[PDB]
Coordinates of C-alpha atoms and ligand atoms in Angstrom, one line a residue:
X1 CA -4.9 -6.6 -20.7
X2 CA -6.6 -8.4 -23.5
X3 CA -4.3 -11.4 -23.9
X4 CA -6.2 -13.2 -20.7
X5 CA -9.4 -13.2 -22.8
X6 CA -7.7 -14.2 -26.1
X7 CA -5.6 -17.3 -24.0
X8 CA -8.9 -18.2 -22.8
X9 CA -10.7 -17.8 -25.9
X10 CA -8.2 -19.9 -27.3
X11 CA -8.0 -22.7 -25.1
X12 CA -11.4 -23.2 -24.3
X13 CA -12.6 -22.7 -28.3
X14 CA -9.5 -24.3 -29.8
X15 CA -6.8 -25.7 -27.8
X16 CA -9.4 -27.4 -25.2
X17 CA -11.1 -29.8 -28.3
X18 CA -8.1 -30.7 -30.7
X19 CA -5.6 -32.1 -28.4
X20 CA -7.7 -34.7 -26.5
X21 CA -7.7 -36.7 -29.8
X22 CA -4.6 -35.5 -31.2
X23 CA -2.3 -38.4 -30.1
X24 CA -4.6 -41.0 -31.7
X25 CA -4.5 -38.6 -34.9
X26 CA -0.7 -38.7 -34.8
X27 CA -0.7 -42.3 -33.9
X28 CA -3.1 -43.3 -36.6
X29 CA -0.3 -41.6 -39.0
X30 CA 2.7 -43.2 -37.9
X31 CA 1.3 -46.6 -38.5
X32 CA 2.3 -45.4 -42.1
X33 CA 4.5 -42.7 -41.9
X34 CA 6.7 -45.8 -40.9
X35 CA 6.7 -47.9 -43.3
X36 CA 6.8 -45.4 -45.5
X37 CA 10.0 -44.1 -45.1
X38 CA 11.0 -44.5 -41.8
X39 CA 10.4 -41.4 -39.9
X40 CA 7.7 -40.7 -36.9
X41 CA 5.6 -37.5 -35.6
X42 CA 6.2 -36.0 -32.9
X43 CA 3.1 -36.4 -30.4
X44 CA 2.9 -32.7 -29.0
X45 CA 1.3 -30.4 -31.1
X46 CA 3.8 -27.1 -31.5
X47 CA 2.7 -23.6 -31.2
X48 CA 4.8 -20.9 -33.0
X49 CA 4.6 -17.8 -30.6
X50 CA 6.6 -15.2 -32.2
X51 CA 6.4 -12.2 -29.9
X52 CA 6.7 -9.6 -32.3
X53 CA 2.8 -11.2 -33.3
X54 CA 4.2 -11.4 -37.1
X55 CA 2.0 -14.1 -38.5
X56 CA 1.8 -14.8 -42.2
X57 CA -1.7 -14.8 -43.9
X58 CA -1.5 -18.0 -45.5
X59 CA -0.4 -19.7 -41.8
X60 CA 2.6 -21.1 -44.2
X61 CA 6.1 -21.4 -42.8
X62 CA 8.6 -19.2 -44.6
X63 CA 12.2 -21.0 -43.1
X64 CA 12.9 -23.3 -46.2
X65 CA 14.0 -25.8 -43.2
X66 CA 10.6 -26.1 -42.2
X67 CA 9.0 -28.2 -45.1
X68 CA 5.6 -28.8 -45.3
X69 CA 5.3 -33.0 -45.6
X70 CA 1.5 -33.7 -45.0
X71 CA -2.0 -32.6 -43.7
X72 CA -2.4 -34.8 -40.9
X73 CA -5.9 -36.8 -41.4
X74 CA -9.4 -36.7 -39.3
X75 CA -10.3 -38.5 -36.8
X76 CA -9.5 -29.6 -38.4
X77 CA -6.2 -28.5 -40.1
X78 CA -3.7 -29.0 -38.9
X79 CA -0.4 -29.5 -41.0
X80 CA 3.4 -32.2 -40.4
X81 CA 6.2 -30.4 -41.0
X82 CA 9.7 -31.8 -41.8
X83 CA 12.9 -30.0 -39.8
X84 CA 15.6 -29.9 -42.2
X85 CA 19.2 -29.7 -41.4
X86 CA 21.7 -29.6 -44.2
X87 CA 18.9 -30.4 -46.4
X88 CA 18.0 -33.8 -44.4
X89 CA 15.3 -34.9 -42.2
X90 CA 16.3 -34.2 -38.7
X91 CA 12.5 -34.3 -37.1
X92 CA 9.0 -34.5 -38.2
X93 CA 6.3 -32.4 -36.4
X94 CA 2.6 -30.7 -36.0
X95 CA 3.4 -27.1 -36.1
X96 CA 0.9 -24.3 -36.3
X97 CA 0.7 -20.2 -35.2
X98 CA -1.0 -19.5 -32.5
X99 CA -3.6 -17.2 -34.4
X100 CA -4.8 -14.8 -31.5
X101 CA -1.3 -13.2 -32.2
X102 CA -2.5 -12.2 -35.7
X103 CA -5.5 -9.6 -32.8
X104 CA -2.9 -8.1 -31.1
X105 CA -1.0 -7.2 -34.3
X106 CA -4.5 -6.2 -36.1
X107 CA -5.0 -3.9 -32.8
X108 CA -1.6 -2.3 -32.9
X109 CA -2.6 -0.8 -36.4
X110 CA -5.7 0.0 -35.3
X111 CA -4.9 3.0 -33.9
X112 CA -8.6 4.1 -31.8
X113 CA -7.3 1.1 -29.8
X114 CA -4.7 3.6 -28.6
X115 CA -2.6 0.4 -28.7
X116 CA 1.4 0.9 -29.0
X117 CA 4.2 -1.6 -30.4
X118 CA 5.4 -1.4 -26.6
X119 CA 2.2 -2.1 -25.7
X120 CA 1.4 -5.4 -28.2
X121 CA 4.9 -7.2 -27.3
X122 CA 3.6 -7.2 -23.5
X123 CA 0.3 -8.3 -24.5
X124 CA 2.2 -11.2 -26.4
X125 CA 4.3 -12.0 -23.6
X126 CA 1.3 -12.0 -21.1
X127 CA -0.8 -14.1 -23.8
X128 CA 2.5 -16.7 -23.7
X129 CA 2.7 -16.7 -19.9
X130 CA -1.5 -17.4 -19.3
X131 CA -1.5 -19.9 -21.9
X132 CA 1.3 -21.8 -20.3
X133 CA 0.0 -21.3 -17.2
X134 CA -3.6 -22.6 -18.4
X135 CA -1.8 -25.7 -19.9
X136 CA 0.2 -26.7 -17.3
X137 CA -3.0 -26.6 -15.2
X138 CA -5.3 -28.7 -17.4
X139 CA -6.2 -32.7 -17.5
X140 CA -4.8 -34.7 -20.6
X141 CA -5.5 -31.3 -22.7
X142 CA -2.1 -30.2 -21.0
X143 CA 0.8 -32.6 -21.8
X144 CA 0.7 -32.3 -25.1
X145 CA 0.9 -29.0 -26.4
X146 CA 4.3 -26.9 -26.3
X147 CA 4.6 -23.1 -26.7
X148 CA 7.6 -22.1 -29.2
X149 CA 8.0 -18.2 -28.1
X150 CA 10.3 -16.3 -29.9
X151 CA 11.8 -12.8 -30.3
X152 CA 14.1 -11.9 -32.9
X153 CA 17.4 -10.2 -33.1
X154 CA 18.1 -16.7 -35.4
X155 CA 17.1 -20.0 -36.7
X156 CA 13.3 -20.9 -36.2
X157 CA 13.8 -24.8 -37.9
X158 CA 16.9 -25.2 -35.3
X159 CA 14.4 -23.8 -32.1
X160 CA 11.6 -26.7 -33.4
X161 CA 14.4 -29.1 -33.1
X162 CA 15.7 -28.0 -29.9
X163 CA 12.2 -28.9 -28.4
X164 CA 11.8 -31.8 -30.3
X165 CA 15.4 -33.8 -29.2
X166 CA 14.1 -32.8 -25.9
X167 CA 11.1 -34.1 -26.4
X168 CA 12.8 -37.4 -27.1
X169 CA 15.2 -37.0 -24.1
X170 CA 12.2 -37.2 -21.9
X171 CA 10.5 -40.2 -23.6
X172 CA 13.5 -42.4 -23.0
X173 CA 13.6 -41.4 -19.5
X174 CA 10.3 -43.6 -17.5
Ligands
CA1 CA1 13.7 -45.5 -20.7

């Protein structure tokens, strides 16, 4: 199956070199982002997974409840979005697509790959389970990324938050 090379390819090229400086990024922020206003980021970066590989061209979130607030500075692009409930602020977050979805889709329509819908949700899965597995074995690269996978029949904003208050949870707890 090709979602062990594209996990790989994807932490070793991406994943692997963003996240050791990511908390410092985020940190960085919130030494305004609280005073301005009086929110906070979330430190894990959050990786939309939706299984059905549907990834929108522009990377943009669709869900009205997930508001773009600000590119997050240097220390490449990576994006803060606000979770809205009833219209308010009810978390603040680095949220991205995990990209190598957008090859399993391109393959499903390609059709020499001989490559079925059947065929790409597995892939997806697999690509889900490697990654986690790859994460949860790695140094400092590991505890602060968290896959968001999804399948659809659903609230995306709500399933950000979900992690997110359990995010919290396990701050307050050691
Ligand atoms: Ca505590």
């Amino acid at each position: 199956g090709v979602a062990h090379g594209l996990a790989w390819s994807y932490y070793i090229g991406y994943l692997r070199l963003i996240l050791p400086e990511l908390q410092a990024r985020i940190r960085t922020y919130n030494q305004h982002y609280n005073n301005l206003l009086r929110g906070a980021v979330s430190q894990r970066l959050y990786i939309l997974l939706p299984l059905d590989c549907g990834v929108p061209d522009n990377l943009s979130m669709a869900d009205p409840n997930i508001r773009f607030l600000d590119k997050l500075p240097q220390q490449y692009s990576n994006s803060i979005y606000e979770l809205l409930e009833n219209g308010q602020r009810a978390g603040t977050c680095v949220l991205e697509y995990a990209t190598p979805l957008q090859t399993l889709f391109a393959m499903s329509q390609y059709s020499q790959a001989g490559f079925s819908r059947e065929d790409r949700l597995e892939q997806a899965k697999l690509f889900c389970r490697t990654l986690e597995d790859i994460l949860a074995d790695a140094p400092e690269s590991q505890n602060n990324c968290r896959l968001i996978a999804y399948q659809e029949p659903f609230s995306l904003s709500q399933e950000v938050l979900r992690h997110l208050r359990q995010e919290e949870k396990e701050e307050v707890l050691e």
